[PDB]
Amino acid sequence: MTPHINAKIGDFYPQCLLCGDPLRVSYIAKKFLQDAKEITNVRNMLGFSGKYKGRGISLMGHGMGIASCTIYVTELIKTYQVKELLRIGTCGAISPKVGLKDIIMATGASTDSKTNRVRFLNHDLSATPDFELSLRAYQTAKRLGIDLKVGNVFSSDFFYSFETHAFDLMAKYNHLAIEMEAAGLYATAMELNAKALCLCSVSDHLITKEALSPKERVESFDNMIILALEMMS
Amino acid sequence: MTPHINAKIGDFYPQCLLCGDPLRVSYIAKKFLQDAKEITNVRNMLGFSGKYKGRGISLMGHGMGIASCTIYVTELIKTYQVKELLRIGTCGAISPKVGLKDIIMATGASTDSKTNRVRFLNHDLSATPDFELSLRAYQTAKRLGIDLKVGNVFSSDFFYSFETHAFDLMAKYNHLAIEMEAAGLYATAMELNAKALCLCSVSDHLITKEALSPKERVESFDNMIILALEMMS
Amino acid sequence: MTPHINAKIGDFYPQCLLCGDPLRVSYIAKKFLQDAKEITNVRNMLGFSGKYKGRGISLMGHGMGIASCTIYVTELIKTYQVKELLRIGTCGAISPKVGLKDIIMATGASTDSKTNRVRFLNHDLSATPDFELSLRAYQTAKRLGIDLKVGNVFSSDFFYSFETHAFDLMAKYNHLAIEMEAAGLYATAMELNAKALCLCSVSDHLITKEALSPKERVESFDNMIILALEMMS
Amino acid sequence: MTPHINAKIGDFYPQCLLCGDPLRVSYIAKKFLQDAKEITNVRNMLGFSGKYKGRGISLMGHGMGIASCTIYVTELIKTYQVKELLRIGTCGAISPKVGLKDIIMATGASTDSKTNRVRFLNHDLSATPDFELSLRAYQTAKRLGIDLKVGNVFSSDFFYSFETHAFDLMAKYNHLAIEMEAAGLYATAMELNAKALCLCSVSDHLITKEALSPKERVESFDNMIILALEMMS
Amino acid sequence: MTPHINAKIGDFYPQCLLCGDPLRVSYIAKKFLQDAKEITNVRNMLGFSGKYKGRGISLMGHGMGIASCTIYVTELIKTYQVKELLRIGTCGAISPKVGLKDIIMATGASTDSKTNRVRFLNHDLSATPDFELSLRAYQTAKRLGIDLKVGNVFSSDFFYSFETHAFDLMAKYNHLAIEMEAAGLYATAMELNAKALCLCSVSDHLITKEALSPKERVESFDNMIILALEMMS
Amino acid sequence: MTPHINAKIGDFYPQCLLCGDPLRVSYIAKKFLQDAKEITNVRNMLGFSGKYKGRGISLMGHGMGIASCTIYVTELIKTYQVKELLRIGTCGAISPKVGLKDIIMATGASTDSKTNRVRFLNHDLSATPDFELSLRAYQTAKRLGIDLKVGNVFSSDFFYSFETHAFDLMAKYNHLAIEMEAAGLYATAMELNAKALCLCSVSDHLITKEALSPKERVESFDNMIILALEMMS
Ligand SMILES: Clc1nc(SCc2ccccc2)c2[nH]cnc2n1
Ligand SMILES: Clc1nc(SCc2ccccc2)c2[nH]cnc2n1
Ligand SMILES: Clc1nc(SCc2ccccc2)c2[nH]cnc2n1
Predict the structure, then answer these.
(1) For chain F, N or C: smaller number of CB within 10 Å?
(2) Where are the domains of chain C?
(3) Which of residues 163-202 of E touch F (CB under 8 A)?
């Protein structure tokens, strides 16, 4: 066991879906998995293992922000032997190319965090997902007829940004939305030689000023959840 | 009313005790408060309002990491009108000046985060608590017979550090322990003109490798809890 | 029409293949294109327009280094209306996952340059290629029987590195090879909403010290050239 | 002896008051100490030892700026065995919370200097005073009926700032005034395990545009001087 | 031989003139040198050796940007034994002190590159030329009656700057013009204990909006070329 | 008229000689000037005006450190209309190219300070002297039979360095000696369009550990003083 996960070694399948919200994770387990079992619950951060269309898959909450996400992903890889990590989170749209509830695949995660400079020689680590997972997401979305939006996200240490004046510049450089964990997921999976990808659905729109309720952030994104389950089967 | 808290405006008392672990918040509510009511539970991050010696006291979990802590503290101040925020938690000791079950009061929080540079003109923000609250902590601790250890902590973006070789230098510069949120708590409270303080309990020494027993950990944390509840009376 | 290119507006096809060495551009024009016409030669940096399997294709040299590459790519997009830019070249391998005559597709370009910090709010820009172009490269490579190696490259301001001790850490974080322009190609193309990609051929392994023979180098580079010309068809 | 102090070892008492201006130091010796002796004068930087209410106390000039202050404080601690260092300087008010000639106690010293990044792993050192000295200053001011203003100061390498547009932001983050040495005093005393505190009286007001003459900067601050002498007795 | 120069050891004279444009180098060889021989041509980057007034002198192209220039200068010094390197390039005027086609001697080369921080402890390397070469240029210009403008240049990684709003500030700090290689020439020659100087003629004026054609950038600067040849004889 | 200088406007001649030590300024006034009058003494930082060979010459102390030097130099230029500023002092040699009683002329001043980044867009300012003044120094030194050693110095915020292991790298890059103000003198004078230069005398070699005798130190410094006074004639 680890300080933040109280499952047994082997309780996790090698493929794991992730959300920051452990209640979205619980929602997915109850609605979409067969024979789902809760396998961890330290700090109320739930994780589960179950089956989708006969294939074992795990689910795990990763909390909010790069530091939190790095903790759980690090332990999932090094202790629990997880090989493929698919984040399915929420994000704030800053580009006019996307609308509320669109699903974005993050081809790269820019950041205002210092974590990657600390990791990577004080240089610019371009944090990126595994290409095969990215390809699988693209192909599965096409097979399902889901309009997958593809581009960079900006992973911030701030939900309440001090730099909103810079969002248009971010969008000009192909950042479709802002969230807070992808760059940490990506850099941890690069560190540890694991396969990771980040999808996020648009829960807030900074141009149109739209925002979903907390309940809607759990329940409104079945399309992104089903996309994730299909690509992992 | 916010994406991360679903309490009604007015549910929070203006004095709030915070922990990273929402189950520790739950423990405090059930064991130490009278008439405790759960008031928020988005993302399983529990908060409560109750009374201690007739005085209204709120409790809120804030998760792991500066970014997570900054979300909750910002919303508590700006939406729920919280005025005093007392963070309690455990911390890994790195200084020979502290030992097991010591309680540290952080009069400064250094960091490897980029957040305060983003907040503060790319310069060095000295992240400090409210002085009156620190004085209140010192006077209450003396009246309870607690020998408070006072110094800096180091707030890291990394639980699994890449710089363990630097702990000794940290200790030389009067950093007694490492944790992961104090600098964000303090910078947010300075931004927003609120009173904040961080106390942390030594259950593990990262240098000597000494660790408390599980019943000593419960006992040590209860002493902290009482110190915190007494200074909010 | 620009200080560095003396072609007439309209001389460039909207799809352009790029190399750092203008003599390699010349080699490609004479060996692989039909009706090739030299269209620019300022500073001896040659560019050409010709046809491959009836399709119009342009070629342009860009010199060595992010700053040099950014000049040419900017002018090609903004003045000559180039829309797709495929960079091919050699790169020094640093990862045990690649070997001699492997072809790498860079889905991210890290850097020791300050350019992307200057472009991007002093934060970390994740410099990434156009996803559709990368997918086109992967599908074309499979149809030609090429096993494309996909990962990051590190774009350095230094040919003669002062940080050779850091190559292993670079490789750990999924940097397969080092070159000197991809991060600038990618950042310029994101700035200007153009589609860009970088492929590089392994003729030298900087770790194992293995090197191709001069006829193997020609042979390896021709395979790249054909892959590039086929994806622009 | 040291390059910058020509006193004998043992000439300094373990408690020392500091000013940047050696003529304020001389003023204090003549007006407030019994049997004051000049004990050092290299570079015209005067230092003294004498008695206040029967208790031995020393005085020393530290010149202007972090670099200058670091030199004298370093030598006072390592060669002359000084244990408690109380800076009593001047500062420029940037916050509407304070007026001309108010006395500020610096709970922390933010800075635009690079010295603490050079000292502290290129991270953010939150430079802070010794808590017991801070407490003593608070209690002595109360006993004397002095209205001690308490908060952060910003220690700058610039008296003539290039960033006056940022002063309101500084004040929002609880920086009451700007001066040029506290962060260096604090970081040197943290380095060397000594007790330090910075008090400063407001000699310039950046909101009301007030400014004292050079003579007034020596002679107008008896209240802060007497506060210092009382807390050290 | 080196990867970027295919001359024999000894083909270069110890004194070498440099331009970024290998066609300006070729122009000088044909128009001004006796018995000029082309001695290198990798990547179309021409170099020559010939005689001026009986004295052997070499010429070499260095391409565009600090990274490119660093490659050729490094190899010229370490392999080809070049002792004195005189850059005679072009630049964009940002100061009202100079006009189109003025000749500037760069007493120092500021930069937005990270290369010197990577070279020099992450501190500020003030990149400067050899004083004796500077003196020789001053004296030769006086003997020839050429009005040599003297001050700093700013060496940028950007020809198309994202910071034009800062050019007036640059000019205030005695930066007469902007170019892209001097800081790299200067830092490489400091690294390797060689003598270097940068002269540049104004080919673009950012205040008056003037700009020369590509042909004029080769042919309009005989005065700077003859100055260079005279100081090296 | 300023917080740090109490001379009357007009008391300063437009040519000023500067030293960090005000007692050295005093020494020069009494030994080398005619009709010397003390004109300022705030903080014991003495300044004088007198004549040398009938020419009016001012002297001013500037203290230790870039921040201290910048205060005095700014006030001298902006309030007292000083136009030429010649700094003389001692410096610790770090290069094998210089030895005891050599005099160095600093044609560049590197630094570990953040001041020039704050002044100059967060980029690298190459801090350089006025060229005409440097030429005047070189011509006067030759006429007096002095073999001036010309190169960079390193201006540090630290007298007691934390980076002594880096002195050799400093020396490699043509830093002949270390001192603590030249970069600030030079940056202030470039900001304000004044002519400045720094000469420093080698009385200590920080590598070889050789040191002058106290009478050799007086003798060496007098030779400097005469060189300075002669170039201001
Ligand atoms: Cl950093 C980030 N920002 C947002 S919207 C920020 C936002 C804040 C205030 C007002 C409007 C919008 C997110 N929505 C889901 N994940 C997210 N991550
Ligand atoms: Cl950095 C600093 N600034 C000031 S007022 C700066 C100031 C400069 C120009 C005009 C008005 C005010 C101080 N007064 C006493 N100590 C101090 N330290
Ligand atoms: Cl960085 C640099 N910039 C310029 S003018 C830039 C410029 C760009 C766009 C429009 C007007 C001017 C140069 N001219 C010769 N060398 C040079 N180096």
Answers:
(1) C
(2) 1-233
(3) 163, 166, 169-170, 172-174, 183, 187, 190-191, 193
